[PDB]
Design a protein around this ligand. Structure first.
Ligand SMILES: N[C@@H](Cc1c[nH]c[nH+]1)C(=O)O
Ligand SMILES: N[C@@H](Cc1c[nH]c[nH+]1)C(=O)O
Ligand SMILES: Nc1ccc(Cl)cc1N
Ligand SMILES: Nc1ccc(Cl)cc1N
Lengths: 413, 413
């Protein structure tokens, strides 16, 4: 016998599971269309150097990578943003801006799940916080579309520019991205573990204190005290909250100075979806990354912002809230030939039903009417169309609503 | 600068290209729904042993495979059918039959394109030729849905049981699959090249002659002469053509004794889509594979049939026929704030438009009304909604159909 289980850390999607996945993706697609985003895709296989950012990120540490027979360093993508940037950089100035691009790539890791799907939404060429507003609104929209409300979830919001200043004032920008990465672990691991990693980086106790203090500031007015009420970060966050309020999602968003995210390239606003019961990891996460494309070699800086919204946590949350009823398969009609002699006519009928835009099966193998009705019920047919000899000569079939009257063929549809 | 081109043999899908892909996939999805097929998926990464069939197949020869760090032999799938079978075998008798499963997996190869998408349709648990009929009808349906007609394309049809007999009568079944694989190359390479490979296998000139002769038989009546009018293969092919005729696609299908296909596991009917101008490779291909699941270790034999329908040839054909007009992006509304002071109201309006199921952008960065209208035109907006101070106090906005009247907010939608 052959191994029936999938490769380590990977999921099979038989029909029942695939319907659940579809329910989720329909929402991501529908939301992207509602917000004017355009679909794109790129190869799951990318060059390894595309991710070599040298900042101690988990996403680069846990790369599912290998070498081709031709000796090329490749990887199954751990995230999409680098593919996006590559695509953007290749377009250059033929690319018209602003651009709003989205996708639902499978992404991979190696260390426990080794793949996940991640809805990516990104706005490109928009300097202002209106991009982040739109992005954050898209994510709430998606969650509400799935049945969640502001009671169930929210979106925490911060700016890395705050911490940028404190790192600048205590020194060298080259170390900022590495620090954000370490400081991201603060919620997870003890302060002792994070302090030591920051000290290992070569930062002194003075700057570490200031970092700690600023992560634990509770309101935007407190950030104004420490940084100034016209630090670009303050005006931006106020603009952001004002705009989200005006769109009607003020109950969904809030400030949190502890939110930095684990990715090196964020420069401005960052955000995280969360459940309001404290039970699950981040539902999504994102932010502004204005320098990435400059780092990839762009002559002109390209402002960007976006998020990723995984397919795991959201599903667990929806299951907990009882918002993932299994929805069984459906089909409009099941055509039932009275017997094999009636098959040709049954096919003709099947053609008519399908030509009208209906979803229709025909009983394929040899079986009794009563077996076929049960079969019809099992596949979730709305209607069973029995094709029998007597009715056929009257130009009719027998129709029976499952959720048996004689009907003229033209009336079936 | 970073490498902007994708990894060797792989395609990028920027928005313009992705729309073309979507047009094609919408059809595969829509067709699968019309025919009552159910979506499934499995990991692109599968165990290498899953494909070790030892019959000299191109699909196994050209495997994009590698070794994990844990020392496991894996591969990026060259086809889906083995994943399907694995999924089916794991379900066992909890699986209800017949089952009609479909997917659109990316599949890979290493040798020139190294990936392609392939619509897979498969019927499971159906002994009779009604499965093949349905499958063949689905493929024609798809092609017509894309704008092709019976003038443009057809589906060639044959049975391997014919050749099965001739191999049996001249000898040992273990060699049958290898022979089908060699005989598949007949159309491509010289008869001398195919003869030598069959002779290399250990088959004598007598059986080779008989093979050649039977591949070049032109009608079903000629196969009846050589094999008998009640060879199961004759009755099946007549049943098949009778049923396809009755469904209304008789002009789309025909017999061809040279069609064997390149895959080892086919046992009964096999078929190939083709363009009637002789310009392109196979558009799709499929057949019955009644022993595969027995070979994977099933206690009870499971009848199966299916096809794969690639995304390359079909597109070239549609391009040649001028049936792939580029269809530009569309969005219902573009909300234009008169200026930044109007942004909050513009957002509120944006919310209303989207709540009504409309697709809507808002101008995100700072720009002049006339720039924003041009922007609206460039994104293919059906309508531009200008939000200006004077109209706002009258409870109105300015609306202008792009494919400027004042309108009350409640009337916008
Ligand atoms: N790539 C990020 C999400 C993102 C998309 N765009 C910007 N950020 C992640 O995996 O967390
Ligand atoms: N796997 C086959 C197509 C197929 C699906 N089901 C049966 N056959 C191919 O790649 O050609
Ligand atoms: N980056 C990433 C890739 C794959 C999985 Cl399953 C999880 C993460 N976090
Ligand atoms: N099996 C296969 C896989 C990938 C490509 Cl691009 C082509 C083929 N034929």
């Amino acid at each position: 016998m052959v191994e029936t289980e999938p490769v380590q850390g990977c999921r099979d999607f038989p029909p029942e599971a695939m319907r659940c996945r579809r329910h989720l993706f329909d929402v991501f697609h529908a939301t992207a269309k509602t917000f004017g985003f355009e679909e794109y895709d790129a190869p799951v296989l990318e060059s390894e150097e595309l991710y070599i950012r040298k900042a101690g990120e988990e996403i680069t540490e846990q790369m599912f990578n290998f070498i081709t027979k031709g000796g090329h360093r490749v990887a199954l993508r751990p995230e999409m943003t680098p593919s996006l940037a590559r695509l953007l950089l290749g377009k250059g100035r033929s690319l018209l801006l602003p651009a709003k691009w989205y996708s639902i790539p499978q992404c991979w890791r190696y260390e426990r799940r080794r793949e996940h799907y991640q809805w990516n939404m990104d706005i490109v060429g928009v300097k202002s916080v209106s991009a982040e507003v739109e992005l954050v609104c898209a994510a709430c929209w998606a969650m509400r579309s799935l049945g969640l409300s502001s009671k169930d979830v929210g979106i925490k919001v911060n700016s890395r520019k705050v911490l940028q200043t404190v790192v600048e004032q205590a020194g060298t920008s080259d170390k900022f991205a590495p620090v954000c990465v370490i400081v991201d672990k603060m919620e997870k691991i003890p302060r002792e573990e994070v302090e030591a990693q920051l000290a290992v980086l070569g930062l002194e106790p003075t700057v570490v204190d200031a970092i700690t203090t600023t992560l634990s500031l509770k309101s935007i007015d407190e950030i104004a005290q420490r940084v100034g009420e016209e630090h670009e970060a303050v005006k931006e966050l106020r603009q952001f909250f004002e705009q989200v309020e005006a769109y009607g999602y003020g109950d969904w968003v809030l400030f949190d100075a502890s939110v930095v995210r684990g990715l090196a390239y964020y420069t401005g606003i960052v955000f995280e979806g969360f459940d309001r019961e404290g039970k699950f990891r981040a539902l999504c996460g994102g932010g502004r990354y204005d320098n990435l494309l400059t780092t990839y070699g762009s002559p002109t800086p390209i402002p960007c912002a976006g998020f990723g919204f995984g397919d795991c946590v959201i599903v667990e949350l929806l299951q907990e809230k009882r918002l993932l009823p299994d929805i069984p398969h459906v089909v409009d009609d099941v055509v039932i030939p009275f017997d094999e002699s009636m098959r040709p006519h049954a096919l003709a009928v099947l053609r008519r039903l399908r030509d009208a835009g209906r979803s229709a099966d025909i009983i394929l193998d040899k079986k009794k009417v009563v077996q076929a009705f049960n079969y019809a019920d099992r596949v979730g047919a709305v209607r069973a169309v029995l094709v029998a000899p007597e009715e056929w000569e009257r130009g009719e079939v027998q129709v029976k609503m499952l959720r048996g009257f004689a009907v003229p063929l033209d009336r079936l549809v």
